[PDB]
Design a binder for this molecule. Structure first.
Ligand SMILES: [Cl-]
Lengths: 215, 216, 122
């Protein structure tokens, strides 16, 4: 069976940079390869058909080429809206031909490091009345994506009781926002005083801690 | 113009059946391949099935062979995916797509919008909405939309009037198997006395609409 | 590649005469040329034909999606009166809306001697 191996699996590139995504066929597939752009949770868009032909509605900065079994998608000058997963796909129109997708290449927009602004939120009285406690830490408008958010409860490091969510890269300025949510039973919440979110990030001279005292 | 409109998605028991519809306009489905392609949480595109309705050529991924049947009604210009013996691993956004050619290659030029199939024994449940109370110059506040199933929920602020500084986070599946997410906004501190902030939450799957006033 | 040369190429793909698509072909060719995008417009037109769509559909889609025509006010065509508007276009004459643009399907504004206006809608 045909394999289409894409490389790299992910890449960061700045606005105006030339981007090169590679797709290797396990054996000869002639020029029978297409390229797609997919925004998260959205319908893929056809960019290139027959290895090198630009589909309608596709800006000129997108181009495709073939050297033997090696297929290349080229973005000549990356734009801030170009973050997406790009897929190659092989297929002939002959009846019962196999369709083979690549595993995708996630393209991230690189920009100047930006430190997060950090906020902490205690659980609401309404949630505590309902019998649970969620503590929320917000990291706003930062780059890069990578951040360490540690929870401390009366200075005791927490593990396995938090979950993170991150926004899609801003379509203008390429920053991220992140939420870390600490989940405690009401009983475990009421047993401690000091709730702290400690953030380590490239843009921070020294970790930033935001804290409150239960009461 | 050419379009593919999908329907039939939603929440189904493990072992259950669900039928997706791909309604075509602007072309005759008889002379194209119609494909189903799905995307599971944290996975890439997986090709599922195809039909060439003129000749009735059907093709299936090994992962769905025996359980899924693809079909077409040319009179309705519609293709169907009959999904039987559904499993957790079939949970995904399902896309249909048109397979076209110029000189013998096979490209997917038109795509449906995608429909979410959730395979689970979990009950539909609406969220509780909790305020994230504001704590120089700029204050952060928000709403925690907790313990809903299935996806999705929508969040607006002040019925869509407030959009500057709004960040609505992707849903996270909690260990419990219920979703949560937060929506936050940064506003002038000076406005906290005077300006009202209300998050408008809609969980269509459970018919749950909540407006939560967020006060300091 | 001049506006007139482009219009004549497009005409070879259009049935009949005095049709809305003929008015559209002439309006788009003139704007495409003036914006220095005649070659890019023709390439885009040929790509849409290659998809099995007819020239009427290709010109309709390009009017809505090609960047040269985005937010461009339709041109004025001077007429004696709305009776001397080519017969096959008379069906498509409408009242001129507040902010008419090519990309919303407003092809041109017919301006009568008596100072009245109608817009050609596709
Ligand atoms: Cl082809």
């Amino acid at each position: 069976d045909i394999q289409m191996t894409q490389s790299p699996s992910s890449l960061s590139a700045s606005v105006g940079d030339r981007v090169t995504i590679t797709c290797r066929a396990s054996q000869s597939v002639s020029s029978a390869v297409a390229w797609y752009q997919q925004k998260p949770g959205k319908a893929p868009k056809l960019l290139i058909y027959s290895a090198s032909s630009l589909y309608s509605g596709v800006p000129s900065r997108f181009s495709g080429s073939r050297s033997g079994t090696d297929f290349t998608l080229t973005i000549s000058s990356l734009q801030p809206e170009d973050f997406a997963t790009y897929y190659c796909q092989q297929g002939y129109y002959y009846a019962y031909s196999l369709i083979t997708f690549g595993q995708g290449t996630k393209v991230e927009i690189k920009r100047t490091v930006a430190a997060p602004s950090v906020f902490i939120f205690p659980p609401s009285d309404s949630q505590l009345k309902s019998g649970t406690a969620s503590v929320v830490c917000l990291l706003n408008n930062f780059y890069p994506r990578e951040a360490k958010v540690q929870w401390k409860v009366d200075n005791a490091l927490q593990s396995g009781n938090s979950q993170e969510s991150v926004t899609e890269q801003d379509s203008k300025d390429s920053t991220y926002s992140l939420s870390s949510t600490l989940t405690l039973s009401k009983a475990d919440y009421e047993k401690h005083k000091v709730y702290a979110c400690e953030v380590t990030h490239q843009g921070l001279s020294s970790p930033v801690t935001k804290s409150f005292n239960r009461g | 113009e050419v379009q593919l409109v999908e329907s039939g998605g939603g929440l189904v028991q493990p072992g259950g059946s669900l039928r997706l519809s791909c309604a075509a306009s602007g072309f005759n489905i008889s002379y194209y391949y119609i494909h189903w392609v799905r995307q599971a949480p944290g996975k890439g595109l997986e090709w599922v099935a195809s039909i060439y309705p003129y000749y009735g050529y059907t093709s299936y991924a090994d992962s769905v062979k025996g359980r899924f049947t693809i079909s077409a009604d040319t009179s309705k210009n519609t293709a169907y995916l009959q999904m039987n013996s559904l499993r957790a691993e079939d949970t995904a956004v399902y896309y249909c797509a048109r397979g076209s050619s110029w000189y013998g290659a096979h490209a997917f030029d038109y795509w449906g919008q995608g429909t979410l199939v959730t395979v689970s024994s979990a009950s539909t449940k609406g969220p509780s909405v909790f305020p994230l109370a504001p704590s120089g110059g700029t204050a952060a506040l928000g709403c925690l939309v907790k313990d809903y199933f299935p996806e999705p929920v929508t969040v607006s602020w002040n019925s869509g009037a407030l959009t500057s500084g709004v960040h609505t986070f992707p849903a996270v599946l909690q260990s419990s198997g219920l979703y949560s997410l937060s929506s936050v906004v940064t506003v002038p501190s000076s406005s906290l006395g005077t300006q009202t902030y209300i998050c408008n939450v809609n969980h269509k799957p459970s018919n749950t609409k909540v407006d939560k006033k967020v006060e300091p | 590649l001049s506006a007139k040369d482009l219009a004549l190429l497009l005409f070879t793909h259009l049935p009949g005469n005095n049709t809305p698509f003929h008015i559209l072909a002439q309006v788009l060719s003139k704007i495409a040329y003036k914006s220095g995008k005649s070659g890019a417009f023709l390439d885009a037109f040929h790509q849409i034909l290659s998809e099995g769509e007819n020239a009427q559909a290709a010109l309709t889609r390009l009017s809505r999606t090609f960047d040269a025509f985005m937010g461009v006010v339709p041109p004025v065509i001077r007429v004696k009166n709305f009776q001397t508007v080519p017969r096959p276009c008379q069906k498509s004459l409408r009242a001129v809306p507040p902010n008419p643009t090519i990309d919303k399907g407003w092809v041109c504004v017919y301006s009568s001697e008596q100072g009245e206006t109608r817009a050609l809608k596709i």
